[PDB]
Design an enzyme around this catalytic site. Structure first.
Site, PDB file in Angstrom:
ATOM      1  N   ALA A   1      10.394   1.692   5.395  1.00 47.94           N
ATOM      2  CA  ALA A   1       9.168   1.207   6.007  1.00 47.94           C
ATOM      3  C   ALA A   1       8.471   0.195   4.618  1.00 47.94           C
ATOM      4  CB  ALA A   1       7.988   1.685   6.779  1.00 47.94           C
TER       5      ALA A   1
ATOM      6  N   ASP B   1       4.413  16.902  12.406  1.00 47.49           N
ATOM      7  CA  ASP B   1       4.198  16.478  10.911  1.00 47.49           C
ATOM      8  C   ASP B   1       3.145  16.486  10.431  1.00 47.49           C
ATOM      9  OD1 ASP B   1       5.252  15.401   8.040  1.00 47.49           O
ATOM     10  OD2 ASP B   1       5.922  13.393   9.275  1.00 47.49           O
TER      11      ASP B   1
ATOM     12  N   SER C   1       5.211   3.037   0.435  1.00 53.57           N
ATOM     13  CA  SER C   1       6.571   2.926   1.371  1.00 53.57           C
ATOM     14  C   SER C   1       7.167   4.070   1.422  1.00 53.57           C
ATOM     15  CB  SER C   1       7.428   1.880   0.579  1.00 53.57           C
ATOM     16  OG  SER C   1       7.372   2.201  -0.880  1.00 53.57           O
TER      17      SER C   1
ATOM     18  N   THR D   1       9.178  18.525   6.730  1.00 56.42           N
ATOM     19  CA  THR D   1       8.941  19.113   4.733  1.00 56.42           C
ATOM     20  C   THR D   1       8.804  20.989   5.065  1.00 56.42           C
ATOM     21  OG1 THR D   1       7.366  17.094   4.597  1.00 56.42           O
ATOM     22  CG2 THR D   1       8.012  18.919   2.601  1.00 56.42           C
TER      23      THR D   1
ATOM     24  N   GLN E   1      10.907   5.744   3.280  1.00 59.50           N
ATOM     25  CA  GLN E   1      12.768   5.076   3.024  1.00 59.50           C
ATOM     26  C   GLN E   1      12.799   4.298   4.317  1.00 59.50           C
ATOM     27  OE1 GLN E   1      15.160   8.109   4.051  1.00 59.50           O
ATOM     28  NE2 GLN E   1      16.909   6.430   3.687  1.00 59.50           N
TER      29      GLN E   1
ATOM     30  N   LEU F   1       0.615  -1.253  -0.069  1.00 62.57           N
ATOM     31  CA  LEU F   1      -0.385  -0.057   0.288  1.00 62.57           C
ATOM     32  C   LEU F   1       1.015   1.515   0.131  1.00 62.57           C
ATOM     33  CD1 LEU F   1      -2.682  -1.033   2.963  1.00 62.57           C
ATOM     34  CD2 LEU F   1      -3.107  -1.047   0.711  1.00 62.57           C
TER      35      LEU F   1
ATOM     36  N   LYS G   1       0.673  17.708   7.309  1.00 66.45           N
ATOM     37  CA  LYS G   1       0.249  18.114   6.114  1.00 66.45           C
ATOM     38  C   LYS G   1      -0.310  17.426   5.063  1.00 66.45           C
ATOM     39  CE  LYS G   1       4.909  15.405   5.021  1.00 66.45           C
ATOM     40  NZ  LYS G   1       5.973  15.052   5.506  1.00 66.45           N
TER      41      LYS G   1
ATOM     42  N   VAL H   1       4.558  -0.492   3.919  1.00 68.40           N
ATOM     43  CA  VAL H   1       3.151  -1.758   4.490  1.00 68.40           C
ATOM     44  C   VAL H   1       1.960  -2.482   3.162  1.00 68.40           C
ATOM     45  CG1 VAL H   1       0.602  -0.562   5.521  1.00 68.40           C
ATOM     46  CG2 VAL H   1       3.198   0.887   4.959  1.00 68.40           C
TER      47      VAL H   1
ATOM     48  N   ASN I   1      -0.922  13.173   5.359  1.00 66.55           N
ATOM     49  CA  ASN I   1      -0.789  12.756   6.219  1.00 66.55           C
ATOM     50  C   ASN I   1      -2.315  12.997   7.262  1.00 66.55           C
ATOM     51  OD1 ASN I   1       2.135  11.551   6.522  1.00 66.55           O
ATOM     52  ND2 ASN I   1       2.238  13.491   7.953  1.00 66.55           N
TER      53      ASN I   1
ATOM     54  N   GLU J   1      -6.638   9.905   0.202  1.00 66.99           N
ATOM     55  CA  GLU J   1      -5.459  11.767   0.776  1.00 66.99           C
ATOM     56  C   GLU J   1      -7.417  11.943   0.999  1.00 66.99           C
ATOM     57  OE1 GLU J   1      -1.892  13.475  -0.882  1.00 66.99           O
ATOM     58  OE2 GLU J   1      -1.452  10.847  -0.500  1.00 66.99           O
TER      59      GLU J   1
ATOM     60  N   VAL K   1      -6.480   2.471   6.767  1.00 65.03           N
ATOM     61  CA  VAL K   1      -7.173   3.345   6.549  1.00 65.03           C
ATOM     62  C   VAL K   1      -7.416   3.447   4.780  1.00 65.03           C
ATOM     63  CG1 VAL K   1      -7.486   6.472   6.273  1.00 65.03           C
ATOM     64  CG2 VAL K   1      -6.481   4.796   8.326  1.00 65.03           C
TER      65      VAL K   1
ATOM     66  N   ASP L   1       0.692   8.884  10.659  1.00 68.75           N
ATOM     67  CA  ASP L   1       2.044   9.173  10.736  1.00 68.75           C
ATOM     68  C   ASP L   1       2.577   9.749  11.910  1.00 68.75           C
ATOM     69  OD1 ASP L   1       4.435   9.444   9.587  1.00 68.75           O
ATOM     70  OD2 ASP L   1       3.747   9.202   7.624  1.00 68.75           O
TER      71      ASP L   1
END
Length: 300
Positions: A23, A137, A19, A178, A21, A17, A139, A25, A142, A98, A94, A159
């Site tokens: 991890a 984090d 990835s 970011t 860097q 589902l 944004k 999923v 997320n 987004e 989930v 996240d």
């Protein structure tokens, strides 16, 4: 120490589902119940010297934050496994994608309708801050939906790899995140707390009403100068059918001094979010998100 059994004994794992860097999923299904989850495989850093993998200290922080939280608008940890090379978080699934991509599929959106999604983010952050947890984090990517095919869809904040307990007795300072989305105190290596999430909420709201990023420059380093100086404008090409109350909202969040920035409690009370009278509720139904431009932003 986490569950030692093979994750494959209790779960049938499926397709990938996504990835980061460090991890991967995958989709999965618990054998004893038939319920569906998602398994986040985080690579353990095995030697202190290594740049690959994530330190035990960073994983334990994420996990114990995740263990601690239970609220309809934040993601739920089901279970945690480990073996020689990974830590495996069984997370709530989930499925709705987004929030910004879903909103981009409508013919229009009033400021009223937009505030109802944003109230959900505000509630999630309210719960977090009341437990002294800063997400660090926030944004758009997320901010997700549980299920997109229903009358009123539920926002899930995801996240927590950057989240921290704010401890009263000791400054926390760091550079991370970011550049377009982080507050000045993050950029300038100053003491951090719950106010950084408030600045990110400002950045999100601005983007939601206009489709323009308030601090995005032509290079990374320009974006940082923009943030640090609080260089932003409401240009008419973008904000000309946006109400005074929405503008005021954003302005009280996008503020350099963190002690003077609006708190989460203050913002649930703001008259854009909670109108005090008929004039205020009127002009919020009357105002529209800039849909043509917004669609372009979720298209990039």
């Amino acid at each position: 120490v986490f569950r030692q059994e093979n994750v494959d004994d209790y779960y049938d794992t499926g397709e990938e589902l996504g990835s980061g860097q460090f991890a991967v999923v995958k989709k999965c299904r618990e054998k004893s119940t038939g319920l569906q989850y998602a398994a986040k495989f985080i690579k353990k850093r095995r030697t202190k010297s290594s740049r690959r993998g994530v330190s035990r200290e960073d994983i334990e922080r994420e996990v114990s934050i995740l263990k601690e939280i239970q609220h309809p608008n934040v993601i739920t940890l089901h279970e945690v496994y480990e073996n020689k090379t990974d830590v495996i978080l069984i997370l709530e699934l989930v499925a709705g994608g987004e929030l910004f991509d879903f909103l981009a599929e409508k013919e229009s959106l009033t400021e009223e309708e937009a505030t109802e999604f944003l109230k959900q983010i505000l509630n999630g952050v309210y719960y977090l801050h009341s437990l002294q947890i800063a997400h660090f984090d926030l944004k758009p990517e997320n901010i997700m939906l549980l299920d997109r095919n229903v009358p009123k869809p539920r926002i899930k904040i995801i996240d927590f790899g950057l989240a921290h307990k704010i401890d009263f007795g000791n400054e926390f300072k760091n550079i991370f995140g970011t550049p377009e989305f982080v507050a000045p105190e993050i950029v300038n290596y100053e003491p951090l707390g719950l106010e950084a999430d408030m600045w990110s909420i400002g950045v999100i709201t601005y983007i939601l009403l206009s489709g323009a990023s308030p601090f995005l420059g032509d290079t990374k380093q320009e974006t940082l100068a923009n943030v640090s100086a609080v260089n932003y404008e409401f240009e008419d090409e973008y904000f000309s059918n946006t109400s005074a109350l929405a503008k005021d909202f954003i302005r009280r969040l996008l503020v350099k001094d963190p002690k003077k920035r609006m708190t989460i409690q203050d913002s649930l009370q703001h008259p854009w979010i909670k109108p005090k009278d008929t004039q205020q509720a009127l002009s919020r139904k009357a105002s529209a998100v800039n849909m043509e431009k917004f669609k372009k932003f979720a298209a990039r």
